[PDB]
Paper text:
ATP-sensitive potassium channels (KATP), composed of Kir6 and SUR subunits, convert the metabolic status of the cell into electrical signals. Functional KATP channels are hetero-octamers composed of four Kir6 subunits and four SUR subunits. SUR subunits are not only targeted by inhibitors, such as insulin secretagogues, but also by activators, such as KATP openers. Here, we present cryo-EM structures of SUR2A and SUR2B subunits in complex with Mg-nucleotides and P1075 or levcromakalim, two chemically distinct KATP openers that are specific to SUR2.
We first solved the cryo-EM structure of SUR2B in the presence of Mg-ADP/Mg-ATP but without KATP openers to the resolution of 3.4 Å. The ABC transporter core of SUR2 shows an occluded state, which is similar to SUR1 in Mg-nucleotide-bound KATP structures. However, the density of TMD0 was missing due to its flexibility, suggesting that TMD0 was unstable without co-assembly with the Kir6 channel. For better visualization of the position of Lev, a fragment of TMD2 in front of Lev was omitted in (b); the residual detergent densities are also omitted. d Empty KATP opener-binding site in the cryo-EM map of the SUR2B subunit in complex with Mg-nucleotides is outlined by dashed lines. We observed that Mg-nucleotides are bound to both nucleotide-binding sites of SUR2. Although we prepared the SUR2B + P1075 samples using Mg-ATP alone, while other SUR2 samples using both Mg-ADP and Mg-ATP, we found that Mg-ATP was bound in the degenerate site and Mg-ADP was bound in the consensus site in all of the structures. As a result, ATP is tightly sandwiched between NBD1 and NBD2, and the degenerate site is fully closed. However, as the C-loop of the opposing NBD1 is away from Mg-ADP, the consensus site is still open. Upon binding of Mg-ADP to NBD2 of SUR2, NBD1 and NBD2 dimerize asymmetrically, with the degenerate site fully closed while the consensus site remains open. The dimerization of NBDs further drives the closure of TMD1 and TMD2 and the occlusion of TMD.
Residue numbers in the entry: 250 to 327, 341 to 612, 665 to 728, 744 to 912, 975 to 1018, 1028 to 1545
The structure:
Amino acid sequence: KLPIAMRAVTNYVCLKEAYEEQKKKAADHPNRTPSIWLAMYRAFGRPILLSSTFRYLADLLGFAGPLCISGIVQRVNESKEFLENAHVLAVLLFLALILQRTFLQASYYVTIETGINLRGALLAMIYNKILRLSTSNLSMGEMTLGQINNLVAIETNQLMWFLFLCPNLWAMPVQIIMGVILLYNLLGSSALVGAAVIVLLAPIQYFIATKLAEAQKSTLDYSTERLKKTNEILKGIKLLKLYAWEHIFCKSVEETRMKELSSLKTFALYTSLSIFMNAAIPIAAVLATFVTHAYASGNNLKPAEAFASLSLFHILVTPLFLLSTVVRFAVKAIISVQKLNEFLLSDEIGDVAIKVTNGYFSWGSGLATLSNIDIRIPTGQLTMIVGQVGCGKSSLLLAILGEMQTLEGKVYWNSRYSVAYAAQKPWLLNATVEENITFGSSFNRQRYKAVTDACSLQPDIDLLPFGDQTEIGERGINLSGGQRQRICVARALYQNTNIVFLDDPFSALDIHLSDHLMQEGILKFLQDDKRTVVLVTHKLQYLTHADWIIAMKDGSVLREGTLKDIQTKDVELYEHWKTLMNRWKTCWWYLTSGGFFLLFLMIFSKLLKHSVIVAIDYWLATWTSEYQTFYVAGFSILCGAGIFLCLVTSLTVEWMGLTAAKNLHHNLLNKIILGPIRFFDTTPLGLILNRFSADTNIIDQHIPPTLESLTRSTLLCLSAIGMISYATPVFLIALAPLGVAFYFIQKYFRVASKDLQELDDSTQLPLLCHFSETAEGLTTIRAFRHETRFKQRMLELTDTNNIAYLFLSAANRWLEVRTDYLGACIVLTASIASISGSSNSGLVGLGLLYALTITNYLNWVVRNLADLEVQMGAVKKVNSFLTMESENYEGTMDPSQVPEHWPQEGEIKIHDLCVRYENNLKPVLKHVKAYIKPGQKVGICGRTGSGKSSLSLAFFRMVDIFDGKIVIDGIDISKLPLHTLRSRLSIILQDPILFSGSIRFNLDPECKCTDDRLWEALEIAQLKNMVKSLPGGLDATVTEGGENFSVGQRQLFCLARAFVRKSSILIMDEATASIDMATENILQKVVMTAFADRTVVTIAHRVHTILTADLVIVMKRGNILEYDTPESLLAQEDGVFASFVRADM
Ligand SMILES: CC(C)CCC[C@@H](C)[C@H]1CC[C@H]2[C@@H]3CC=C4C[C@@H](OC(=O)CCC(=O)O)CC[C@]4(C)[C@H]3CC[C@]12C
Ligand SMILES: Nc1ncnc2c1ncn2[C@@H]1O[C@H](COP(=O)(O)OP(=O)(O)OP(=O)(O)O)[C@@H](O)[C@H]1O
Ligand SMILES: Nc1ncnc2c1ncn2[C@@H]1O[C@H](COP(=O)(O)OP(=O)(O)O)[C@@H](O)[C@H]1O
Ligand SMILES: [Mg+2]
Ligand SMILES: [Mg+2]
């Protein structure tokens, strides 16, 4: 598959051992900063040393040029008989050239091999780091999943590209100094002035690199922030669109984008300055050297000395072409390795089945979240943990798993055994349903079918495209919340471990599915296997089945024992429980984004600059043909104009790139957020966030440099061809054969590169997805103790990706070799033609010296052209989203028709409403009719899939209405603008979507609310005390996803977010699914006493809540069966609502 030397495992072992030695060295000194750079040096130096050796040989074979040009010019002008003959010299020059290119390609080969090995090793290192880092890093804002993915995607690759270019950073100094010494030999002391001019590049480039590094660090910071915001928007589109907050968040993202673009503009300015200095300092050096020689050495330059000197100046200039690129990549790689080294130095993890004694545990802050934890989990018996929101239940489970640092106490596990964890927030991989349920276990049809039947997944999976073999999770078909949770519980049940930790598996399930699970999946299956079970549920009706009961309050265990033991000891708690139970074209578009003034300005300026440079060389040739005021003046003005045009041409391309990036991202963002919700439901979030992150990174930072280098190289090559044709006209005859060869080699390689690039992309997306899915749900992987299998999967995937990239690099080597040999042929033919058929001795020198140049710059033209193609692909994709369908915000109803207080009364009339999500799909609602009075408390109930949530989203026109009316306060919502409808009605969704920032930001992003009303809403939502206790009060931070809070607390925050708006109609959709009964009862009482005037429709998770309601609706497959008061439905014999009440109680 891949040679043992290039397997990721061996390179990883080497790098890890070197890094561990560096860690020991750091431990010794107070510096205490293990350095990745030295570890990489020790591990992978010898390859780079070999590459440097090859490059140093190539440099001498390059200096071979000036000598032969001198000899040929001298002989055309006027033992060892073969040595001087011009044709013999030309043959020798061709041979030396091919050998130099061979050595150069050898160095490039060694460096690419080492870079790929090091990328594999580093990905392995940071992956093992992911498998070791503590979740308290992601929970407290120390880092994010986005940063962990950014490392893998951008920063490792940037370091790899830098390693590709690494040898230059010391080979170029050597070559420049050697050229200066030889120039001294030729030109006397006059060459030392030019030597000083050239030397001044080192201070200049160091300063420019300092500024570039500052700018790049700022750009990376702002890009991370911008992508954080964009990812949150893409994930929470549903809530943002329902609340009409889309544009506020879009504006915030645009502000961060403006800051990032300012940083990018500073970086572009200094990159343009570096290019300008690199190009100009040689022109100034030539001017100074030759003026000084004219005025110092009375003897004029004979043609031989002159053309040798000009050739040496070309040899000096050739390395300077790359210097800007290498400084760019070195600065970016320095920042990347700083990030990687920060990541790799972070926080890491430190009968009775499980007993905890005097356990104090904390979530990393250093303050105990649990205290005096004295518990025991009896072996082979069901334990049930019961408590109100935020009482340390999930915390207790994770503490037993050892996921949070222990301040005191011990845990005994009569090393940890594999425990089956079904986390409260279900986590699914990107494999099929069968792969999620089996989760690395031998398939057994009997057990698989039993578990699937227990979790009632069979009806759901046969409705999927390819039942039991459909790609689930991100990058595949999405599943409803209940489906995902039941799949996760099925995964937990199917494994053959002995301890099963189920953290609230009934949150999304309805009464029927929940009861079926509780009976068949747990009480029967797990007891038949005699497995220990620990349940964390608010379903107090199941306490009769429990064998051991743990009661938690305010982080500490209040009481523990059997039900009878609790009744005997703590009568209060048992009585409380009983009371609670009631017992291409894209390239042209990118270029045109400038507006036809910057594009044409750029092209014209670059043409003129290259013309002036070649004119400088021609003037030197003619001047030394003299063998004077006029010549010095002409030379000086030529050089000055060259410098000026260098400056202009340096600025133009970078400005074009800045503008293109800004416009592309702005269009993408604005069009994406306006799209219909169906688009986000259908398209995986990956296919959008990738556009926003990776393609945007390309368009911002990779296209402008590639384009500018491409233009420089191509214009140098064309200019050399023109100068040669002027020197020897017959060369135009030989131009056609070589051009044909060029076309054919490029044809073949371009198709090959397309194919291998497709392979590389297809092999890397699974690797990034693996890093993602392991970063998330880390606790699950470490609970099943499947870390070894995941390490193996990572190793094999990275080996596959490395094989793909190795083939791509081999194709690059093929084309580089072919084109370099074509250039060598060009040099040989041009030298012969100039020797035999040129008019003046000066012309042959110019022709030969530009023949030398074509070889180097043709390779760059080819390589940069291919890179520009692959990079324009992303512009093609980002622009593609500009084709999307956009939701109709216009609205037919006139603004004057809409009152100032539209939902003043709150009455709604639903007339023959029928709704479906996409055309040619099943109508989920069927001729539903409703009449809710103003100031009416309605309760809607039913089984999952009855269309309650469809009816809820109908009010906000998030579901397409085939036929019907929804008349709210006398206006058909279809006529109104979308935002006036979606802003004057409030809805509480079941799944809490909480953004990063303060409590204020989540409660009121617009900051249009006084703190008093925020406190009021928090008090209604039963969170006033917790927020008061928090360090910052209403300014306290919320991490991404609200992970620093409990799930129930997240839902309560989502309730406060709706209570603040204070509209007249409130659609609460199963909002108390994750909230416990104790909190839920008081919350409902307070909401009824507070919103008594408004109309509230509550899609209820438990019918006990809507037992007290003015009106009750029961849905069944989109049909309203019964429409009356709860008393009437209860008194109906064999009614549906009565059965619901019996089951729930
Ligand atoms: C002029 C001739 C003789 C050689 C042309 C290249 C060289 C001048 C070498 C010597 C000094 C080197 C530079 C000096 C140090 C840096 C800064 C370095 O980035 C940092 O030091 C981090 C930023 C910071 O210091 O805060 C990136 C490479 C770079 C530009 C080096 C690139 C290669 C340079 C320019
Ligand atoms: N990931 C976390 N990082 C840091 N602190 C946390 C984290 N999760 C919860 N906390 C803190 O732990 C305390 C206890 O919450 P815990 O996570 O144990 O909730 P829970 O009782 O299992 O939740 P619920 O019953 O509402 O589902 C909360 O006050 C919260 O501040
Ligand atoms: N995002 C969606 N796209 C298309 N169809 C959906 C979507 N969500 C649910 N449905 C379909 O609508 C029907 C009712 O779903 P839903 O409204 O979620 O019921 P509930 O009232 O239990 O939430 C189901 O049969 C399901 O197939
Ligand atoms: Mg919990
Ligand atoms: Mg629903």
